[PDB]
Design an enzyme around this catalytic site. Sequence first.
Site, PDB file in Angstrom:
ATOM      1  N   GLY A  49       0.444  -1.194  -0.155  1.00  0.00           N
ATOM      2  CA  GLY A  49      -0.277  -0.018  -0.060  1.00  0.00           C
ATOM      3  C   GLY A  49       0.486   1.513   0.105  1.00  0.00           C
ATOM      4  O   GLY A  49       2.544   1.251  -0.516  1.00  0.00           O
ATOM      5  N   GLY A  60       5.785   7.868  -0.032  1.00  0.00           N
ATOM      6  CA  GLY A  60       6.181   6.660  -0.906  1.00  0.00           C
ATOM      7  C   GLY A  60       5.484   5.389  -0.826  1.00  0.00           C
ATOM      8  O   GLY A  60       3.745   6.167  -0.636  1.00  0.00           O
ATOM      9  N   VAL A  67       4.753   1.183  -0.192  1.00  0.00           N
ATOM     10  CA  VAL A  67       5.140  -0.086   0.847  1.00  0.00           C
ATOM     11  C   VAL A  67       5.209  -0.902  -0.305  1.00  0.00           C
ATOM     12  O   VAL A  67       3.833  -1.692  -0.480  1.00  0.00           O
ATOM     13  CB  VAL A  67       4.653   0.436   1.973  1.00  0.00           C
ATOM     14  N   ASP A 103       0.083  10.296  14.117  1.00  0.00           N
ATOM     15  CA  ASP A 103      -0.560   9.813  13.597  1.00  0.00           C
ATOM     16  C   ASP A 103      -0.779   8.165  13.784  1.00  0.00           C
ATOM     17  O   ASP A 103      -1.340   7.540  12.755  1.00  0.00           O
ATOM     18  CB  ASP A 103      -0.114  10.017  11.672  1.00  0.00           C
TER      19      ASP A 103
HETATM   20  C1  LIG Z   1       6.993  -0.218   7.936  1.00  0.00           C
HETATM   21  C2  LIG Z   1       6.758  -0.942   6.829  1.00  0.00           C
HETATM   22  C3  LIG Z   1       5.727  -2.092   6.774  1.00  0.00           C
HETATM   23  C4  LIG Z   1       5.985  -3.463   7.198  1.00  0.00           C
HETATM   24  N1  LIG Z   1       5.138  -4.096   7.236  1.00  0.00           N
HETATM   25  N2  LIG Z   1       3.745  -3.654   6.723  1.00  0.00           N
HETATM   26  C5  LIG Z   1       2.430  -3.686   6.875  1.00  0.00           C
HETATM   27  N3  LIG Z   1       2.363  -4.929   7.115  1.00  0.00           N
HETATM   28  C6  LIG Z   1       0.974  -5.279   7.485  1.00  0.00           C
HETATM   29  C7  LIG Z   1       0.365  -6.174   6.290  1.00  0.00           C
HETATM   30  C8  LIG Z   1      -0.691  -5.183   5.323  1.00  0.00           C
HETATM   31  C9  LIG Z   1      -0.909  -5.506   4.311  1.00  0.00           C
HETATM   32  C10 LIG Z   1      -0.393  -6.411   3.503  1.00  0.00           C
HETATM   33  N4  LIG Z   1       0.388  -6.717   4.185  1.00  0.00           N
HETATM   34  O1  LIG Z   1       1.572  -7.874   3.228  1.00  0.00           O
HETATM   35  C11 LIG Z   1       1.173  -6.988   4.609  1.00  0.00           C
HETATM   36  C12 LIG Z   1       1.783  -3.414   6.606  1.00  0.00           C
HETATM   37  C13 LIG Z   1       2.408  -1.992   6.302  1.00  0.00           C
HETATM   38  N5  LIG Z   1       1.388  -0.740   5.913  1.00  0.00           N
HETATM   39  C14 LIG Z   1       0.334  -0.854   5.985  1.00  0.00           C
HETATM   40  C15 LIG Z   1      -0.321  -0.361   4.715  1.00  0.00           C
HETATM   41  C16 LIG Z   1      -0.477   1.302   4.288  1.00  0.00           C
HETATM   42  C17 LIG Z   1       1.781   1.484   4.347  1.00  0.00           C
HETATM   43  C18 LIG Z   1       1.889   0.345   5.625  1.00  0.00           C
HETATM   44  C19 LIG Z   1       1.485   1.771   6.684  1.00  0.00           C
HETATM   45  C20 LIG Z   1       2.659   2.086   7.994  1.00  0.00           C
HETATM   46  O2  LIG Z   1       3.586   1.328   7.432  1.00  0.00           O
HETATM   47  N6  LIG Z   1       4.166  -1.479   6.219  1.00  0.00           N
HETATM   48  C21 LIG Z   1       4.428  -1.978   6.805  1.00  0.00           C
END
Ligand SMILES: CCc1cnn2c(NCc3ccc[n+](O)c3)cc(N3CCCC[C@H]3CCO)nc12
Lengths: 275, 287
Positions: free
Chosen positions: B10, B15, B17, B126
Amino acid sequence: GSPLPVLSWANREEVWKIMLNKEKTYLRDQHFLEQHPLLQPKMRAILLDWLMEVCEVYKLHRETFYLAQDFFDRYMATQENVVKTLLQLIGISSLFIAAKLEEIYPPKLHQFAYVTDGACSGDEILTMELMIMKALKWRLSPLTIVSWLNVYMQVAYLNDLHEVLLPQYPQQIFIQIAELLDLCVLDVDCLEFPYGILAASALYHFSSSELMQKVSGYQWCDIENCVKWMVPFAMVIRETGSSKLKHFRGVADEDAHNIQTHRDSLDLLDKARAK
Amino acid sequence: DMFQKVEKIGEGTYGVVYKAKNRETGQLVALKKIRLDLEMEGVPSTAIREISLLKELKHPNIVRLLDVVHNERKLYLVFEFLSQDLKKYMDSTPGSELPLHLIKSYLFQLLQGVSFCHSHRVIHRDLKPQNLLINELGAIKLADFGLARAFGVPLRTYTHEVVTLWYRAPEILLGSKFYTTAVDIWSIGCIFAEMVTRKALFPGDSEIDQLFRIFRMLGTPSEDTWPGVTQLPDYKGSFPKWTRKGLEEIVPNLEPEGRDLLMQLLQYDPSQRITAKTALAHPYFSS
Ligand SMILES: CCc1cnn2c(NCc3ccc[n+](O)c3)cc(N3CCCC[C@H]3CCO)nc12
């Protein structure tokens, strides 16, 4: 150890320990210009003085200036044999990073380029900022000299122990001490002293040892060498007279003490280092 | 680069992810990618802040930054990967998949993470379920520090209208000059209630709708409940004068002591609002 009152939001001793460990993790060398053997300390003093002037024109915070000074001095200590013609670019790039960190509405890259008057382009600044940040390993959260003065002043003037985060110190004492600190920081010898001891020593020169100890926790043995180093600087400030608080367009008047100013300090620095 | 970019998780505060895997290690990572070619001002403030904070902010309940890679006109933040975020977990599961004991352990961990941040002089600004990452062992970590700030003691005036509207504290909605670490505690109270109710506590459409939803349930604030509230930039005598609804009716399945915690987390007056450190000492967490 902690000069701080009891805090609701954290342990006072822990908050103060965390802060002192930071000071040790961020390392400064008063001799870093020995790695750049054909540069003189006057070159650094001119560069930093120029950055204060840029700051005043763009109503940047004192915090932004002191962040840039720290990045400048720590970056230079990671490098070797830097030609004198690149200092303006390294300085202005340091300030560019500092502004993006600290400012709500930082100036655009075009303004950082504009003040260099042709010497530095936006592309050069974008390249250099990355070089700086990687050399520093993205360690960009120091406790600056002025951050220590902010907290010492708060402890000195604290009325509400339930409002330790809401600032409640007078403006004219703050800018008077900052003026002395702005003069000292132009001399590279200042880097021998931890930034909290520089803040404490400049406060002591406008104060007593009673207050210095109360707001800082330091003893005389701790600041003695710094205090003694700083004397010609204090004297010159006393003899030239202190500056009055300025109003800045678009800046709340109760926030104006936080804006970096600029006087003709390279004359004071000559006068001071004479002695 | 050295990663099999499994997919796009997402978009963050900045940026994009991606989920990916290391070829050498085979380890699963998250990749927050910045396109430096599309950035007129170089590395974004948000990114510089997040990297600089997470280099020195290490705690069981905070996401770990593993590496920062600069290759081309691209900057990659490499993070430990977690398998679920709290938003998607709660959108995919029954209430039974979020029992009362898992809410308690989730909230405890969130407070320990936030308390660690406040003691390191950082505000998230946030905190919402999408930014809360959960592993399969029962850990919850705070993520996305792109909207965070290191604060000074004492603090200065910082950016206004911060925090996602639903989780935004009323002192920010009333345009207060100074906000503190209390804004992070409001969000936590909103998330706590959302976990128990399975839906957002204050799902507002505007700043004024948001502020009316809050007043409807907590009551309209007065100089008696919140000293100085009338002197706040966006306060209006024109406001309706609702009265406190009982929390027992919003969150009936929640135990007595837990309803006391939620009431203290969601105090109007940011000066009378419990801290993360005090909240961890609450009786709720001692059975
Ligand atoms: C810090 C980087 C990171 C590491 N894991 N992760 C997850 N993992 C869970 C998850 C959710 C849905 C699909 N998948 O495959 C895994 C989600 C996520 N985020 C949530 C959605 C928007 C971006 C971002 C926001 C918060 O960092 N960021 C990260």
